Design a protein around this ligand. Structure first.
Ligand SMILES: NC(=O)c1ccc[n+]([C@@H]2O[C@H](COP(=O)([O-])OP(=O)(O)OC[C@H]3O[C@@H](n4cnc5c(N)ncnc54)[C@H](O)[C@@H]3O)[C@@H](O)[C@H]2O)c1
Length: 179
């Protein structure tokens, strides 16, 4: 059961960041072949099979991965451009983003920016926002974002996981509170 986390984490690396380092070239929507990914994962964990990966996909709590037939992709978090077809979140009134406090003086000046990824990632869920923010450092703040502000400015919000949402950027006057 903790072997699943090891393989799931390498999957995120390959599917979000450096497919080229395993000699994979994802298509425009971000998909690679399921056979490609197993063969790529095998040169680190040779025990890995297509069923193990399909178990990982179906089980994932956030919906990190997507399988269409024989192809697989990460649904968000990429650091190379992709063409995702997610649905627009038109109902959320508030969204959340956790980040180390040390980041706040720049965010207040520039808003949230995608940094190394393609999109800014926010959450419909306060706990998941705080938990991801905690990965970078121990002192985390919870940013509350007015979603309607973003829509009015043209930045549409898309449902990329269970609670994960993606936007181009969050201008600072759409951040209503930092907690
Ligand atoms: N941060 C969250 O609340 C959150 C919510 C949902 C999902 N996730 C997921 O967690 C993982 C990491 O996401 P992440 O949001 O930590 O991003 P990341 O790993 O790309 O780290 C970027 C960091 O830069 C900070 N930052 C943003 N704008 C900045 C600015 N103008 N000046 C200085 N710093 C700035 C961000 O808050 C974040 O801490 C990804 O898988 C993402 O999808 C994160």
């Amino acid at each position: 059961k903790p072997e699943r986390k090891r393989v799931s984490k390498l999957m995120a690396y390959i599917l979000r960041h450096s497919p080229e380092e395993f000699g994979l070239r994802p298509d425009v929507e971000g998909f690679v072949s399921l056979n490609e990914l197993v063969n790529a994962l095998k040169t680190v964990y040779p025990e890995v099979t297509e069923e193990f990966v399909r178990e990982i996909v179906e089980n994932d709590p956030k919906g990190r991965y997507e399988i269409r037939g024989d192809r697989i992709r990460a649904r968000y978090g990429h650091s190379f451009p992709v063409s995702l077809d997610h649905e627009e979140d038109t109902e959320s009134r508030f969204l959340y983003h956790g980040t180390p406090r040390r980041n706040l003086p720049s965010i207040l000046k520039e808003g949230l920016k995608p940094m190394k990824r393609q999109y800014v990632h926010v959450s419909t869920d306060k706990i998941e926002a705080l938990e991801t923010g905690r990965r970078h450092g121990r002192e985390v703040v919870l940013l509350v974002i007015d979603a309607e502000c973003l829509r009015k400015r043209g930045f549409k919000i898309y449902k990329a996981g269970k609670n994960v949402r993606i936007v181009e950027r969050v201008p600072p006057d759409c951040i209503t509170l930092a907690v």
